[PDB]
Amino acid sequence: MNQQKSLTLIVALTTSYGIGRSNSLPWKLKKEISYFKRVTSFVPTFDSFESMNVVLMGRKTWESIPLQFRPLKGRINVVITRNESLDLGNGIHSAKSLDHALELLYRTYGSESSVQINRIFVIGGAQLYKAAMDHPKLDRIMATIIYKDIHCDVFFPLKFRDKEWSSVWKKEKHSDLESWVGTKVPHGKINEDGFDYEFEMWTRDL
Ligand SMILES: NC(=O)C1=CN([C@@H]2O[C@H](COP(=O)(O)OP(=O)(O)OC[C@H]3O[C@@H](n4cnc5c(N)ncnc54)[C@H](OP(=O)(O)O)[C@@H]3O)[C@@H](O)[C@H]2O)C=CC1
Ligand SMILES: CCOC(=O)CCCCCOc1ccc(OC)c(Cc2cnc3nc(N)nc(N)c3c2C)c1
């Protein structure tokens, strides 16, 4: 009664698995953010009458996002942090672990609640990504690959695109990415600001 959905991780990362610098992103990509927004917000139309997605994030990611952009708009935010500390949010949820967030979500958004959960995303940062990679329900990574070894000080925790992980994690066809995300998605290299990047979807078997 708690294991009733897969998790999806969404991340932008360099070819060296770099995700962050000096507690922020070290690139400026508005289209890449709009992608993150489309994907994390997308609900099939028939369901969209009553259903919403969830974004789970570490408290350091929470702080990292500019004040203007919180909570992240038409999704259910849950911030994961290990001491019932002092957050202070407009209906904004707190849990001490990934599984405690899941239980809090299923208790709050039940068979009867007006709002119903479609998909659940883990949106960072490295510490929460590491918990999600270890979680038996994670089966999908939405990766934006950034083809530049931009200096980072925080890294994604498991080299899921490298040969050692290649019997577990498989890159899907672009048409399957678009089928999952519900829209046409740019295919191949996109250039904003001196770097190529591209959108990928990886899966593993549960
Ligand atoms: N490129 C991308 O797509 C993304 C990049 N980022 C970047 O990542 C950096 C943040 O990464 P990181 O430093 O790991 O920060 P995290 O966001 O993972 O936050 C870490 C804090 O969240 C809490 N936490 C995380 N995992 C758990 C867990 N399993 N159980 C309990 N509490 C947990 C802890 O809080 P406490 O200390 O409260 O106990 C921990 O100290 C920033 O640079 C941000 O810009 C973030 C998201 C996406
Ligand atoms: C109120 C007006 O709102 C508007 O007009 C719309 C602006 C939309 C901004 C909100 O979305 C943002 C904004 C900034 C961010 O860090 C600056 C992030 C964190 C981020 C970014 N890329 C990301 N990209 C990927 N592939 N994955 C992530 N996990 C991710 C993550 C967590 C998200």
PDB file of C-alpha atoms and ligand atoms in Angstrom:
ATOM      1  CA  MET A   1       0.000   0.000   0.000  1.00  0.00           C
ATOM      2  CA  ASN A   2       2.943   2.348  -0.516  1.00  0.00           C
ATOM      3  CA  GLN A   3       4.683   0.839  -3.525  1.00  0.00           C
ATOM      4  CA  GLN A   4       2.066   2.078  -6.072  1.00  0.00           C
ATOM      5  CA  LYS A   5       4.109   4.073  -8.442  1.00  0.00           C
ATOM      6  CA  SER A   6       7.486   4.106 -10.215  1.00  0.00           C
ATOM      7  CA  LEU A   7       9.777   7.089  -9.643  1.00  0.00           C
ATOM      8  CA  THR A   8      11.401   9.188 -12.353  1.00  0.00           C
ATOM      9  CA  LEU A   9      14.572  11.239 -11.880  1.00  0.00           C
ATOM     10  CA  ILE A  10      15.150  14.334 -14.022  1.00  0.00           C
ATOM     11  CA  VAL A  11      18.594  15.905 -14.271  1.00  0.00           C
ATOM     12  CA  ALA A  12      20.844  18.090 -16.462  1.00  0.00           C
ATOM     13  CA  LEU A  13      24.419  16.923 -16.361  1.00  0.00           C
ATOM     14  CA  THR A  14      27.785  17.257 -18.116  1.00  0.00           C
ATOM     15  CA  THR A  15      29.612  14.436 -19.834  1.00  0.00           C
ATOM     16  CA  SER A  16      31.623  14.215 -16.610  1.00  0.00           C
ATOM     17  CA  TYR A  17      28.422  13.959 -14.514  1.00  0.00           C
ATOM     18  CA  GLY A  18      28.718  17.509 -13.287  1.00  0.00           C
ATOM     19  CA  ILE A  19      25.392  18.896 -11.945  1.00  0.00           C
ATOM     20  CA  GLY A  20      26.183  21.930  -9.855  1.00  0.00           C
ATOM     21  CA  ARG A  21      28.571  24.659  -8.834  1.00  0.00           C
ATOM     22  CA  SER A  22      28.737  27.079  -5.954  1.00  0.00           C
ATOM     23  CA  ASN A  23      25.191  25.938  -4.855  1.00  0.00           C
ATOM     24  CA  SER A  24      23.516  26.709  -8.225  1.00  0.00           C
ATOM     25  CA  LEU A  25      23.610  25.554 -11.930  1.00  0.00           C
ATOM     26  CA  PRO A  26      26.623  26.509 -13.758  1.00  0.00           C
ATOM     27  CA  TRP A  27      24.896  27.158 -17.020  1.00  0.00           C
ATOM     28  CA  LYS A  28      22.122  29.497 -18.165  1.00  0.00           C
ATOM     29  CA  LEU A  29      19.704  27.571 -20.417  1.00  0.00           C
ATOM     30  CA  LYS A  30      16.125  28.922 -20.593  1.00  0.00           C
ATOM     31  CA  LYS A  31      14.913  26.289 -23.103  1.00  0.00           C
ATOM     32  CA  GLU A  32      16.363  23.513 -20.878  1.00  0.00           C
ATOM     33  CA  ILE A  33      14.438  24.936 -17.932  1.00  0.00           C
ATOM     34  CA  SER A  34      11.284  25.095 -20.060  1.00  0.00           C
ATOM     35  CA  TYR A  35      11.816  21.440 -20.867  1.00  0.00           C
ATOM     36  CA  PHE A  36      12.152  20.592 -17.180  1.00  0.00           C
ATOM     37  CA  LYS A  37       8.927  22.528 -16.575  1.00  0.00           C
ATOM     38  CA  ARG A  38       7.020  20.796 -19.455  1.00  0.00           C
ATOM     39  CA  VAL A  39       8.128  17.392 -18.400  1.00  0.00           C
ATOM     40  CA  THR A  40       7.516  17.804 -14.671  1.00  0.00           C
ATOM     41  CA  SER A  41       4.075  19.378 -15.361  1.00  0.00           C
ATOM     42  CA  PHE A  42       2.724  17.116 -18.134  1.00  0.00           C
ATOM     43  CA  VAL A  43      -0.401  15.133 -17.333  1.00  0.00           C
ATOM     44  CA  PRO A  44      -2.517  13.328 -20.015  1.00  0.00           C
ATOM     45  CA  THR A  45      -5.640  15.352 -20.789  1.00  0.00           C
ATOM     46  CA  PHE A  46      -8.337  12.933 -19.659  1.00  0.00           C
ATOM     47  CA  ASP A  47      -6.602  12.508 -16.268  1.00  0.00           C
ATOM     48  CA  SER A  48      -5.745  16.242 -16.103  1.00  0.00           C
ATOM     49  CA  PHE A  49      -9.133  17.156 -14.746  1.00  0.00           C
ATOM     50  CA  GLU A  50      -8.129  15.780 -11.281  1.00  0.00           C
ATOM     51  CA  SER A  51      -4.445  14.608 -11.432  1.00  0.00           C
ATOM     52  CA  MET A  52      -1.089  16.501 -10.735  1.00  0.00           C
ATOM     53  CA  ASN A  53       2.599  15.556 -10.574  1.00  0.00           C
ATOM     54  CA  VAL A  54       4.920  15.672  -7.604  1.00  0.00           C
ATOM     55  CA  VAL A  55       8.471  17.045  -7.420  1.00  0.00           C
ATOM     56  CA  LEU A  56      10.661  15.729  -4.678  1.00  0.00           C
ATOM     57  CA  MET A  57      13.831  17.682  -3.905  1.00  0.00           C
ATOM     58  CA  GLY A  58      16.623  17.990  -1.312  1.00  0.00           C
ATOM     59  CA  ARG A  59      16.584  20.925   0.982  1.00  0.00           C
ATOM     60  CA  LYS A  60      19.846  22.301  -0.702  1.00  0.00           C
ATOM     61  CA  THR A  61      18.008  22.256  -4.124  1.00  0.00           C
ATOM     62  CA  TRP A  62      15.131  23.923  -2.457  1.00  0.00           C
ATOM     63  CA  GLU A  63      17.436  26.775  -1.332  1.00  0.00           C
ATOM     64  CA  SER A  64      19.168  26.786  -4.793  1.00  0.00           C
ATOM     65  CA  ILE A  65      16.062  27.733  -6.699  1.00  0.00           C
ATOM     66  CA  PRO A  66      15.521  31.519  -6.874  1.00  0.00           C
ATOM     67  CA  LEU A  67      12.888  32.704  -4.448  1.00  0.00           C
ATOM     68  CA  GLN A  68      10.614  33.853  -7.322  1.00  0.00           C
ATOM     69  CA  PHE A  69      10.293  30.284  -8.611  1.00  0.00           C
ATOM     70  CA  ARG A  70       9.086  28.538  -5.418  1.00  0.00           C
ATOM     71  CA  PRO A  71       7.329  26.505  -4.776  1.00  0.00           C
ATOM     72  CA  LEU A  72       7.806  25.185  -8.262  1.00  0.00           C
ATOM     73  CA  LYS A  73       4.406  26.206  -9.832  1.00  0.00           C
ATOM     74  CA  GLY A  74       1.682  23.651 -10.811  1.00  0.00           C
ATOM     75  CA  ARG A  75       3.167  20.591  -9.064  1.00  0.00           C
ATOM     76  CA  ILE A  76       3.215  19.267  -5.478  1.00  0.00           C
ATOM     77  CA  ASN A  77       6.564  20.150  -3.885  1.00  0.00           C
ATOM     78  CA  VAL A  78       8.009  18.048  -1.144  1.00  0.00           C
ATOM     79  CA  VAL A  79      11.292  18.990   0.327  1.00  0.00           C
ATOM     80  CA  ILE A  80      13.272  16.113   1.832  1.00  0.00           C
ATOM     81  CA  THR A  81      15.236  17.006   5.023  1.00  0.00           C
ATOM     82  CA  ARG A  82      16.524  15.044   8.081  1.00  0.00           C
ATOM     83  CA  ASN A  83      15.564  17.293  10.872  1.00  0.00           C
ATOM     84  CA  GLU A  84      11.917  18.477  11.163  1.00  0.00           C
ATOM     85  CA  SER A  85      13.814  21.772  11.216  1.00  0.00           C
ATOM     86  CA  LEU A  86      12.312  25.109  10.208  1.00  0.00           C
ATOM     87  CA  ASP A  87      11.127  25.487   6.604  1.00  0.00           C
ATOM     88  CA  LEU A  88       8.134  27.864   6.591  1.00  0.00           C
ATOM     89  CA  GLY A  89       5.994  27.263   3.500  1.00  0.00           C
ATOM     90  CA  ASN A  90       2.639  28.129   1.923  1.00  0.00           C
ATOM     91  CA  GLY A  91       1.237  24.578   2.150  1.00  0.00           C
ATOM     92  CA  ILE A  92       4.718  23.139   1.312  1.00  0.00           C
ATOM     93  CA  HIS A  93       5.566  19.691   2.500  1.00  0.00           C
ATOM     94  CA  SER A  94       8.354  18.259   4.366  1.00  0.00           C
ATOM     95  CA  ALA A  95       9.570  14.659   4.805  1.00  0.00           C
ATOM     96  CA  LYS A  96      12.600  13.043   6.377  1.00  0.00           C
ATOM     97  CA  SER A  97      13.283  10.500   3.575  1.00  0.00           C
ATOM     98  CA  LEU A  98      12.149   9.435   0.129  1.00  0.00           C
ATOM     99  CA  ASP A  99       9.929   6.736   1.621  1.00  0.00           C
ATOM    100  CA  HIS A 100       8.500   9.088   4.239  1.00  0.00           C
ATOM    101  CA  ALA A 101       7.632  11.464   1.413  1.00  0.00           C
ATOM    102  CA  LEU A 102       5.895   8.686  -0.443  1.00  0.00           C
ATOM    103  CA  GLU A 103       3.852   7.713   2.603  1.00  0.00           C
ATOM    104  CA  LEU A 104       3.001  11.351   3.270  1.00  0.00           C
ATOM    105  CA  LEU A 105       1.866  11.717  -0.349  1.00  0.00           C
ATOM    106  CA  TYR A 106      -0.370   8.605  -0.417  1.00  0.00           C
ATOM    107  CA  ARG A 107      -1.922   9.575   2.978  1.00  0.00           C
ATOM    108  CA  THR A 108      -2.623  13.143   1.752  1.00  0.00           C
ATOM    109  CA  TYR A 109      -3.689  12.429  -1.803  1.00  0.00           C
ATOM    110  CA  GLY A 110      -5.951   9.367  -1.401  1.00  0.00           C
ATOM    111  CA  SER A 111      -8.883   7.645  -3.214  1.00  0.00           C
ATOM    112  CA  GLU A 112     -11.032  10.537  -2.023  1.00  0.00           C
ATOM    113  CA  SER A 113      -8.834  13.723  -1.946  1.00  0.00           C
ATOM    114  CA  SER A 114      -9.769  16.287  -4.546  1.00  0.00           C
ATOM    115  CA  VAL A 115      -6.248  16.232  -6.005  1.00  0.00           C
ATOM    116  CA  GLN A 116      -4.824  12.900  -7.359  1.00  0.00           C
ATOM    117  CA  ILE A 117      -1.174  11.989  -8.126  1.00  0.00           C
ATOM    118  CA  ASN A 118      -0.107  11.235 -11.725  1.00  0.00           C
ATOM    119  CA  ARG A 119       3.750  10.956 -11.813  1.00  0.00           C
ATOM    120  CA  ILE A 120       6.422  11.450  -9.152  1.00  0.00           C
ATOM    121  CA  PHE A 121       9.800  13.077 -10.047  1.00  0.00           C
ATOM    122  CA  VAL A 122      13.017  13.353  -8.086  1.00  0.00           C
ATOM    123  CA  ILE A 123      14.486  16.668  -9.188  1.00  0.00           C
ATOM    124  CA  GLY A 124      17.825  16.743  -7.204  1.00  0.00           C
ATOM    125  CA  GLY A 125      20.300  17.306  -5.809  1.00  0.00           C
ATOM    126  CA  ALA A 126      23.151  14.763  -5.631  1.00  0.00           C
ATOM    127  CA  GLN A 127      22.294  13.482  -2.150  1.00  0.00           C
ATOM    128  CA  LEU A 128      18.630  12.928  -3.018  1.00  0.00           C
ATOM    129  CA  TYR A 129      19.630  11.525  -6.426  1.00  0.00           C
ATOM    130  CA  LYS A 130      21.812   8.976  -4.622  1.00  0.00           C
ATOM    131  CA  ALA A 131      18.856   7.886  -2.442  1.00  0.00           C
ATOM    132  CA  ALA A 132      16.696   7.603  -5.583  1.00  0.00           C
ATOM    133  CA  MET A 133      19.236   5.538  -7.482  1.00  0.00           C
ATOM    134  CA  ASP A 134      19.238   3.126  -4.499  1.00  0.00           C
ATOM    135  CA  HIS A 135      15.375   3.022  -4.410  1.00  0.00           C
ATOM    136  CA  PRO A 136      13.721  -0.083  -5.878  1.00  0.00           C
ATOM    137  CA  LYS A 137      10.982   1.945  -7.539  1.00  0.00           C
ATOM    138  CA  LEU A 138      13.190   4.278  -9.603  1.00  0.00           C
ATOM    139  CA  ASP A 139      13.116   3.048 -13.199  1.00  0.00           C
ATOM    140  CA  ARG A 140      13.588   6.171 -15.421  1.00  0.00           C
ATOM    141  CA  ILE A 141      16.032   9.003 -15.805  1.00  0.00           C
ATOM    142  CA  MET A 142      15.248  12.059 -17.916  1.00  0.00           C
ATOM    143  CA  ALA A 143      18.794  13.270 -18.635  1.00  0.00           C
ATOM    144  CA  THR A 144      19.832  16.422 -20.416  1.00  0.00           C
ATOM    145  CA  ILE A 145      23.357  15.820 -21.557  1.00  0.00           C
ATOM    146  CA  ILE A 146      25.614  18.807 -21.685  1.00  0.00           C
ATOM    147  CA  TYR A 147      28.597  18.297 -24.010  1.00  0.00           C
ATOM    148  CA  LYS A 148      31.078  20.414 -22.137  1.00  0.00           C
ATOM    149  CA  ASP A 149      33.203  19.591 -19.103  1.00  0.00           C
ATOM    150  CA  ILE A 150      32.013  22.771 -17.269  1.00  0.00           C
ATOM    151  CA  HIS A 151      33.614  23.062 -13.806  1.00  0.00           C
ATOM    152  CA  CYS A 152      31.354  21.615 -11.178  1.00  0.00           C
ATOM    153  CA  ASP A 153      31.683  20.902  -7.467  1.00  0.00           C
ATOM    154  CA  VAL A 154      28.748  18.449  -7.173  1.00  0.00           C
ATOM    155  CA  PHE A 155      28.282  15.358  -9.292  1.00  0.00           C
ATOM    156  CA  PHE A 156      25.614  12.929 -10.115  1.00  0.00           C
ATOM    157  CA  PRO A 157      26.314   9.865  -7.992  1.00  0.00           C
ATOM    158  CA  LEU A 158      26.192   6.887 -10.392  1.00  0.00           C
ATOM    159  CA  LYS A 159      27.730   6.749 -13.920  1.00  0.00           C
ATOM    160  CA  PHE A 160      24.532   5.420 -15.539  1.00  0.00           C
ATOM    161  CA  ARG A 161      25.672   6.303 -19.157  1.00  0.00           C
ATOM    162  CA  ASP A 162      28.996   4.437 -18.843  1.00  0.00           C
ATOM    163  CA  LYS A 163      29.813   0.830 -19.846  1.00  0.00           C
ATOM    164  CA  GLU A 164      29.849  -0.550 -16.285  1.00  0.00           C
ATOM    165  CA  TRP A 165      26.081   0.278 -15.949  1.00  0.00           C
ATOM    166  CA  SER A 166      25.035  -0.558 -19.487  1.00  0.00           C
ATOM    167  CA  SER A 167      23.338  -3.934 -18.786  1.00  0.00           C
ATOM    168  CA  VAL A 168      21.056  -2.173 -16.202  1.00  0.00           C
ATOM    169  CA  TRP A 169      20.420   1.271 -17.813  1.00  0.00           C
ATOM    170  CA  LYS A 170      19.385   1.523 -21.466  1.00  0.00           C
ATOM    171  CA  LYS A 171      18.868   4.617 -23.550  1.00  0.00           C
ATOM    172  CA  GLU A 172      15.376   4.693 -25.193  1.00  0.00           C
ATOM    173  CA  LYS A 173      14.472   5.737 -28.785  1.00  0.00           C
ATOM    174  CA  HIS A 174      13.663   9.418 -29.189  1.00  0.00           C
ATOM    175  CA  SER A 175      10.108   8.577 -30.287  1.00  0.00           C
ATOM    176  CA  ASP A 176       9.696   6.712 -26.961  1.00  0.00           C
ATOM    177  CA  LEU A 177      10.949   9.782 -25.082  1.00  0.00           C
ATOM    178  CA  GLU A 178       8.360  11.913 -26.946  1.00  0.00           C
ATOM    179  CA  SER A 179       5.633   9.195 -26.287  1.00  0.00           C
ATOM    180  CA  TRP A 180       6.440   9.387 -22.561  1.00  0.00           C
ATOM    181  CA  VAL A 181       6.653  13.211 -22.307  1.00  0.00           C
ATOM    182  CA  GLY A 182       3.467  13.534 -24.514  1.00  0.00           C
ATOM    183  CA  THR A 183       4.963  15.991 -27.049  1.00  0.00           C
ATOM    184  CA  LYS A 184       7.495  16.496 -29.798  1.00  0.00           C
ATOM    185  CA  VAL A 185      10.819  17.133 -28.224  1.00  0.00           C
ATOM    186  CA  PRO A 186      13.838  18.557 -29.881  1.00  0.00           C
ATOM    187  CA  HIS A 187      15.930  15.650 -31.274  1.00  0.00           C
ATOM    188  CA  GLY A 188      19.714  15.886 -31.267  1.00  0.00           C
ATOM    189  CA  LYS A 189      21.996  18.804 -30.370  1.00  0.00           C
ATOM    190  CA  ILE A 190      20.568  22.108 -29.088  1.00  0.00           C
ATOM    191  CA  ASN A 191      22.876  25.101 -28.739  1.00  0.00           C
ATOM    192  CA  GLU A 192      22.299  27.837 -26.197  1.00  0.00           C
ATOM    193  CA  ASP A 193      25.473  29.719 -25.054  1.00  0.00           C
ATOM    194  CA  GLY A 194      28.541  27.940 -26.533  1.00  0.00           C
ATOM    195  CA  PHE A 195      27.568  24.355 -25.459  1.00  0.00           C
ATOM    196  CA  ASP A 196      25.660  21.585 -27.317  1.00  0.00           C
ATOM    197  CA  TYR A 197      23.099  19.682 -25.200  1.00  0.00           C
ATOM    198  CA  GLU A 198      20.480  17.057 -25.915  1.00  0.00           C
ATOM    199  CA  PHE A 199      17.592  15.281 -24.295  1.00  0.00           C
ATOM    200  CA  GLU A 200      17.773  11.578 -23.388  1.00  0.00           C
ATOM    201  CA  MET A 201      15.616   9.045 -21.628  1.00  0.00           C
ATOM    202  CA  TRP A 202      17.085   6.054 -19.844  1.00  0.00           C
ATOM    203  CA  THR A 203      15.270   3.160 -18.228  1.00  0.00           C
ATOM    204  CA  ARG A 204      15.934   0.100 -16.262  1.00  0.00           C
ATOM    205  CA  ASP A 205      13.846  -2.919 -15.424  1.00  0.00           C
ATOM    206  CA  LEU A 206      12.281  -3.016 -11.877  1.00  0.00           C
TER     207      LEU A 206
HETATM  208  N1  LIG B   1      21.796  19.890 -12.831  1.00  0.00           N
HETATM  209  C1  LIG B   1      20.607  19.552 -12.308  1.00  0.00           C
HETATM  210  O1  LIG B   1      19.653  19.015 -12.908  1.00  0.00           O
HETATM  211  C2  LIG B   1      20.409  19.826 -10.796  1.00  0.00           C
HETATM  212  C3  LIG B   1      21.483  20.376 -10.092  1.00  0.00           C
HETATM  213  N2  LIG B   1      21.253  20.665  -8.695  1.00  0.00           N
HETATM  214  C4  LIG B   1      22.395  21.193  -7.911  1.00  0.00           C
HETATM  215  O2  LIG B   1      22.733  20.244  -6.911  1.00  0.00           O
HETATM  216  C5  LIG B   1      23.352  20.995  -5.814  1.00  0.00           C
HETATM  217  C6  LIG B   1      22.614  20.362  -4.642  1.00  0.00           C
HETATM  218  O3  LIG B   1      23.088  19.001  -4.433  1.00  0.00           O
HETATM  219  P1  LIG B   1      23.270  18.437  -2.951  1.00  0.00           P
HETATM  220  O4  LIG B   1      24.407  19.257  -2.321  1.00  0.00           O
HETATM  221  O5  LIG B   1      23.369  17.001  -2.837  1.00  0.00           O
HETATM  222  O6  LIG B   1      21.942  18.884  -2.300  1.00  0.00           O
HETATM  223  P2  LIG B   1      20.523  18.160  -2.071  1.00  0.00           P
HETATM  224  O7  LIG B   1      19.567  18.980  -2.664  1.00  0.00           O
HETATM  225  O8  LIG B   1      20.422  16.666  -2.299  1.00  0.00           O
HETATM  226  O9  LIG B   1      20.181  18.464  -0.479  1.00  0.00           O
HETATM  227  C7  LIG B   1      20.919  17.825   0.493  1.00  0.00           C
HETATM  228  C8  LIG B   1      20.145  18.026   1.723  1.00  0.00           C
HETATM  229  O10 LIG B   1      18.779  17.521   1.530  1.00  0.00           O
HETATM  230  C9  LIG B   1      18.557  16.492   2.546  1.00  0.00           C
HETATM  231  N3  LIG B   1      18.561  15.092   2.037  1.00  0.00           N
HETATM  232  C10 LIG B   1      18.972  14.692   0.805  1.00  0.00           C
HETATM  233  N4  LIG B   1      18.826  13.378   0.685  1.00  0.00           N
HETATM  234  C11 LIG B   1      18.280  12.932   1.840  1.00  0.00           C
HETATM  235  C12 LIG B   1      17.872  11.691   2.293  1.00  0.00           C
HETATM  236  N5  LIG B   1      18.038  10.609   1.514  1.00  0.00           N
HETATM  237  N6  LIG B   1      17.344  11.581   3.517  1.00  0.00           N
HETATM  238  C13 LIG B   1      17.188  12.650   4.281  1.00  0.00           C
HETATM  239  N7  LIG B   1      17.549  13.856   3.909  1.00  0.00           N
HETATM  240  C14 LIG B   1      18.107  14.010   2.691  1.00  0.00           C
HETATM  241  C15 LIG B   1      19.666  16.683   3.579  1.00  0.00           C
HETATM  242  O11 LIG B   1      19.159  17.753   4.295  1.00  0.00           O
HETATM  243  P3  LIG B   1      19.615  18.128   5.874  1.00  0.00           P
HETATM  244  O12 LIG B   1      21.194  18.607   5.801  1.00  0.00           O
HETATM  245  O13 LIG B   1      18.384  19.065   5.898  1.00  0.00           O
HETATM  246  O14 LIG B   1      19.505  16.897   6.706  1.00  0.00           O
HETATM  247  C16 LIG B   1      20.851  17.098   2.719  1.00  0.00           C
HETATM  248  O15 LIG B   1      21.882  17.781   3.475  1.00  0.00           O
HETATM  249  C17 LIG B   1      23.151  22.472  -6.204  1.00  0.00           C
HETATM  250  O16 LIG B   1      24.366  22.827  -6.885  1.00  0.00           O
HETATM  251  C18 LIG B   1      21.985  22.471  -7.153  1.00  0.00           C
HETATM  252  O17 LIG B   1      22.044  23.643  -8.043  1.00  0.00           O
HETATM  253  C19 LIG B   1      20.005  20.376  -8.083  1.00  0.00           C
HETATM  254  C20 LIG B   1      18.942  19.844  -8.792  1.00  0.00           C
HETATM  255  C21 LIG B   1      19.035  19.573 -10.181  1.00  0.00           C
HETATM  256  C1  LIG B   2       7.165  32.896 -11.439  1.00  0.00           C
HETATM  257  C2  LIG B   2       7.445  32.916 -12.949  1.00  0.00           C
HETATM  258  O1  LIG B   2       7.826  31.594 -13.403  1.00  0.00           O
HETATM  259  C3  LIG B   2       8.173  31.550 -14.729  1.00  0.00           C
HETATM  260  O2  LIG B   2       7.902  32.516 -15.453  1.00  0.00           O
HETATM  261  C4  LIG B   2       8.837  30.291 -15.335  1.00  0.00           C
HETATM  262  C5  LIG B   2      10.324  30.073 -15.016  1.00  0.00           C
HETATM  263  C6  LIG B   2      10.642  28.595 -14.686  1.00  0.00           C
HETATM  264  C7  LIG B   2      11.621  28.537 -13.507  1.00  0.00           C
HETATM  265  C8  LIG B   2      11.377  27.383 -12.522  1.00  0.00           C
HETATM  266  O3  LIG B   2      12.154  26.206 -12.877  1.00  0.00           O
HETATM  267  C9  LIG B   2      13.424  26.336 -12.405  1.00  0.00           C
HETATM  268  C10 LIG B   2      14.052  27.581 -12.405  1.00  0.00           C
HETATM  269  C11 LIG B   2      15.347  27.677 -11.918  1.00  0.00           C
HETATM  270  C12 LIG B   2      16.008  26.552 -11.436  1.00  0.00           C
HETATM  271  O4  LIG B   2      17.276  26.736 -10.989  1.00  0.00           O
HETATM  272  C13 LIG B   2      17.580  28.058 -11.472  1.00  0.00           C
HETATM  273  C14 LIG B   2      15.389  25.303 -11.434  1.00  0.00           C
HETATM  274  C15 LIG B   2      16.035  23.998 -10.933  1.00  0.00           C
HETATM  275  C16 LIG B   2      16.225  23.016 -12.112  1.00  0.00           C
HETATM  276  C17 LIG B   2      16.457  23.580 -13.361  1.00  0.00           C
HETATM  277  N1  LIG B   2      16.639  22.823 -14.440  1.00  0.00           N
HETATM  278  C18 LIG B   2      16.574  21.481 -14.320  1.00  0.00           C
HETATM  279  N2  LIG B   2      16.737  20.798 -15.464  1.00  0.00           N
HETATM  280  C19 LIG B   2      16.711  19.460 -15.459  1.00  0.00           C
HETATM  281  N3  LIG B   2      16.851  18.835 -16.642  1.00  0.00           N
HETATM  282  N4  LIG B   2      16.489  18.780 -14.321  1.00  0.00           N
HETATM  283  C20 LIG B   2      16.333  19.421 -13.151  1.00  0.00           C
HETATM  284  N5  LIG B   2      16.145  18.613 -12.094  1.00  0.00           N
HETATM  285  C21 LIG B   2      16.335  20.837 -13.111  1.00  0.00           C
HETATM  286  C22 LIG B   2      16.159  21.632 -11.967  1.00  0.00           C
HETATM  287  C23 LIG B   2      15.905  21.088 -10.542  1.00  0.00           C
HETATM  288  C24 LIG B   2      14.092  25.223 -11.920  1.00  0.00           C
END
